[PDB]
């Protein structure tokens, strides 16, 4: 059987607005060498921040780091902005031959120094209502609320982030239970409220 794997050393990057750059480690967990290709996308995953090196070889079982650097750019100062860092590991009768590659993407959260505190301080501040046949979260904080666990009426809802000062609509009971993911990639404590 064929084996693939790419490990990023963190699961999100908190990029302090206007910082020179941040380092993130990349690990080739496989028995073979790979090309590591790193790309940044906008919040819509359409193709400001620079990744160095944009492409480089990583030997078997080896670990290296990327530098993510902000060069220029203007962002809001009243809220986080979101990009994505994608790290792709590029490996070296009808018969079928399929080759795969893992593209491992994590959130790059651009955080103004003007914002006070962190998401876990505000995680309880989400409110909920049902409207249009959907569960609707409202996020009054300036932080992306990256839900990692969501339950409505005891049923699992697949998570999604709630953008700052905005809403998200989940598909489909009074009680909503949620946990956000903290800056370090850990699942935070459980909160509950009934829908309005």
């Amino acid at each position: 059987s064929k084996e693939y794997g790419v490990t990023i050393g963190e699961s999100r990057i908190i990029y302090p607005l206007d910082a020179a750059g941040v380092m993130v480690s990349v690990k080739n967990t496989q028995d073979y060498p790979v090309l590591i290709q790193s790309r940044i996308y906008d919040e819509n995953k359409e193709k400001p921040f620079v990744v160095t090196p944009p492409l480089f070889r990583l030997d078997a079982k080896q670990q290296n780091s990327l530098r993510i650097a902000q060069a220029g750019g203007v962002f809001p100062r009243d809220k986080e902005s979101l990009k994505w860092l994608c790290v792709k590991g590029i490996p070296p009768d009808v018969g079928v031959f399929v080759q795969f590659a893992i593209n491992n993407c994590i959130k790059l959260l651009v955080r103004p120094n003007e914002l006070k505190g962190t998401p876990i301080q505000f995680a309880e501040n989400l409110s909920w209502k049902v409207d249009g046949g959907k569960l609707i979260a409202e996020n009054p904080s300036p932080f992306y609320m990256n839900i990692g666990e969501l339950t409505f009426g005891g049923k699992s809802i697949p998570s999604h982030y709630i953008p700052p000062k905005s809403t998200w609509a989940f598909d489909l009971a009074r009680n909503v239970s949620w946990r956000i993911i903290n800056d370090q990639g850990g699942l935070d404590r459980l909160y509950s409220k009934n829908v309005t």
Partner: protein, 149 residues
Amino acid sequence: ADLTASTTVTVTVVEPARITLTYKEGAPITIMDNGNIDTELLVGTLTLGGYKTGTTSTSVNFTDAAGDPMYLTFTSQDGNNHQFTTKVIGKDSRDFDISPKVNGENLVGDDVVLATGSQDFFVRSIGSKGGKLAAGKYTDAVTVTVSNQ
């Protein structure tokens, strides 16, 4: 005499974003006497691992060069461009059909949370809109994108 001092020590503990993939080949594909290949043949079994519990089926996207939404396209290597399509599907906890995005779209089922630990997906044959597949080697180069929560 005993002297004392005190400090508060804070430690940052981080979770990495680990993503693994195992591909197990299925049986070779045999052409029937009318020249068709069968439908729903197990071409192969993909096992996605490494991800954090809460990872969803819409945050996984298999893409290929043909870019046909919902289908992976396999192409002959003889220069004649014979193609067949395949779908990628799996089972959830209540044993219902689910799928990841394939070229940006789900073929079947509702958005779901992936099984804890790992999730098996099955590459299954649909067929060819052309028909008349020649014997030969058919290939696809597939990227698997996982957008971590």
